[PDB]
Design a protein around this ligand. Structure first.
Ligand SMILES: O=C(O)c1ccc(-c2nn(C(=O)c3c(Cl)cccc3C(F)(F)F)c3ccc(Cl)cc23)c(OCc2ncccn2)c1
Ligand SMILES: O=C(O)c1ccc(-c2nn(C(=O)c3c(Cl)cccc3C(F)(F)F)c3ccc(Cl)cc23)c(OCc2ncccn2)c1
Lengths: 260, 261
C-alpha cells in the first residue's frame, strides 16, 4: 500500500513520459476527428481513386495498405519500448524478462492505442493527416478485408469508456508489467511493480471519473477483450502468410510473433 | 452502502452453500489430510473403486469412460449453477432469454473455477469428496485424453495460489454470471447494473477477508482472462476429439442430454 501522494506522483510521471513517447495522443486525435477546426482537417480515403489522390496530397492495393499498417506497427513497437523504459523498476528487471514483457505486451498496447485513433467510421493515419474509412478497409479483397474490421469492433467498445491520455498512460504500464507472461524468470519483482501501478490506476480513475462507477473493474475486464483479439490476429496473419508471398514482416515484428 | 454490500455478500454465501454439494472448505480438509477417500492412481484401482464405491459417472475403453465421467459431472454442475443463479438479487427479473443466454455462456467459466476448489497439484476429488483421482493417472491417459485432463490442473494450481475461500467465491461466481458482453443479450443495462453491485461487494469482501493481500481484487479480475482463454482452448479440444474418435457413441438420448458440453 503506497501513500496517496506517492500514487499521484507516479501518475504524473507516467503521463509525462507517455506524452514524450507517443507523438499522436488521444487528445490530438479527438480534436482532429471531432473537427470544428479548419487547420487540422484530414484528407479522407474512402475508395481507390481517393487513395491514389491521397498519396499525392499526403503492387496490389490491399497489400499496400497492409504494408502501411505493419510499418506503423513497427514504429509503435519502438515507441512502446521507449515508454516501457520510463516505467519505474522496469529497466532494473532481469534482461530476459524485459524482452518477454515487451514481446507479449506490445500487441495488446497497439490495439489499445489504436482505439484512440478510431471512431465508428474510420481511423486516423499518417500522423493525423489522413483518415481511412472503415467501410473501405472492410471491403478489401481475400483475407485483408476481414483482417481490418475486428480492430474497429474493439475500439468502439473500448472508446465507450471515455478514457483520456492520463488514464491510458497508467493502463498501458499495467499491461506491460504482467507477471503471467509465459517464460518469466522472476515473477515477484514484476508483480510488485504492477501492484503499485494498479494502485495508481485505481486512484487515478476515481479522481478523474468520480461518477463512473467501477470503471477500474471494467477497464481490467477489457484486458480480456485485448487478450482474445491478439490471439485472433496472430491466427489471421498465419493464414495470410501461407497464402501471400508478396510480403515479408519487419524483423522486429518478425521475432515478436515467434513465441505466440 | 457498506452494510448493504455485506448483506449481499452474506446472502450469496448462504445460497452458495445450499446449491453446491462439496464446498471448498470441506474439499481442502480432505485434500490436505486433515475417513480417507478411495484413491484412483492406476487401472486396477479404478476397477476396484467402481466395484466398491460405484461412481455414477464412470459407468468401452477406460480413457473414454473417464472423459465421459467428466462430462456427466459437468451436466450436474450446470443444474447446480443454474439454481444458484436464481438466488442472485435481480437475476430472475431479467428477460428470460437473457437469463438463458447468461447461463449458456457462463457455465463453462464457472465449472473451471469451481473445479479448482476440488484440485491440488496431485489430483482431484470426485463423488462429493469420496474419491480422489491422481493427476498422474489422468495425465497418462492415451491419445488426446491425457492432454485434455492436464490443462485443468495447470489452471487450478495457479488459481488456487490466490487462496480464495467460499465467501469470496460466491461473489466471484455471481460476477461471472452477470457478464453484459455475452453474445445475443437483449437488455444489457440491467445485467451491468447488477454486475456493478456485485463487483462493489466483491471488492469490499476481499479487502475485509484478505486485508494483507494487496490488490487481490485486480488479480482476481485478471484471472477472468485466463478463464476466457482456457474455455476457448477447451472448445478446440472437444472438436478434435469428436472428429477423431469413432468409439464414442452413447445412446442417442444420452447424446441429447450432453449436447452443449
Ligand atoms: O498509428 C498507430 O499507432 C497504428 C497502430 C497500428 C496500426 C494497425 N496495425 N494493424 C495490424 O494489422 C497490426 C497490428 Cl494492430 C499490430 C501488429 C502488427 C500488425 C500488422 F503487421 F499486421 F500490420 C492494423 C490493422 C488495421 C488497421 Cl485499420 C490499423 C492497423 C495502425 O494502422 C493505421 C493504418 N490504417 C490503414 C492504413 C495505414 N495505416 C496505426
Ligand atoms: O465436481 C465438480 O464440480 C466437477 C466439475 C468439473 C469436472 C470436470 N470437468 N471437466 C471438463 O472437461 C469440463 C469442464 Cl472443466 C467445463 C465444462 C465442461 C467440461 C466437460 F464437459 F468437457 F467435461 C474436467 C476435465 C478434467 C478433470 Cl480432472 C475434471 C473435469 C469434474 O470432474 C471431476 C472428475 N475428474 C476426473 C474424472 C472424473 N471426474 C468435477
Amino acid at each position: 500500500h503506497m501513500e496517496s501522494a506517492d500514487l499521484r506522483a507516479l501518475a504524473k510521471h507516467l503521463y509525462d513520459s507517455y506524452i514524450k513517447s507517443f507523438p499522436l495522443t488521444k487528445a490530438k486525435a479527438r480534436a482532429i476527428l471531432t473537427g470544428k477546426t479548419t487547420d487540422k482537417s484530414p484528407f479522407v480515403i474512402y475508395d481507390m481513386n481517393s487513395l491514389m489522390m491521397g498519396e499525392d496530397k499526403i503492387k496490389e492495393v490491399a497489400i499496400r495498405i497492409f504494408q502501411g499498417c505493419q510499418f506503423r506497427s513497427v514504429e509503435a513497437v519502438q515507441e512502446i519500448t521507449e515508454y516501457a523504459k520510463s516505467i519505474p523498476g522496469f529497466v532494473n528487471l532481469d534482461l530476459n524478462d524485459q524482452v518477454t514483457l515487451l514481446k507479449y505486451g506490445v500487441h495488446e498496447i497497439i490495439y489499445t492505442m489504436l482505439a484512440s485513433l478510431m471512431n465508428k467510421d474510420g481511423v486516423l493515419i499518417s500522423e493525423g493527416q489522413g483518415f481511412m474509412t472503415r467501410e473501405f478497409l472492410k471491403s478489401l479483397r481475400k483475407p485483408f478485408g476481414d483482417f481490418m474490421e475486428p480492430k474497429f469492433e474493439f475500439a468502439v467498445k473500448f472508446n465507450a469508456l471515455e478514457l483520456d491520455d492520463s488514464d491510458l498512460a497508467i493502463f498501458i504500464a499495467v499491461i506491460i508489467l504482467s507477471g503471467d507472461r509465459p517464460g518469466l524468470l522472476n515473477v515477484k519483482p514484476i508483480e510488485d511493480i504492477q501492484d503499485n501501478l494498479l494502485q495508481a490506476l485505481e486512484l487515478q480513475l476515481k479522481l478523474n471519473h468520480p461518477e463512473s462507477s467501477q470503471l477500474f473493474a471494467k477497464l481490467l475486464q477489457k484486458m480480456t477483450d485485448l487478450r482474445q483479439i491478439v490471439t485472433e490476429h496472430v491466427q489471421l496473419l498465419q493464414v495470410i502468410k501461407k497464402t501471400e508471398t508478396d510480403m515479408s514482416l519487419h524483423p522486429l515484428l518478425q521475432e515478436i510473433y515467434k513465441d505466440l
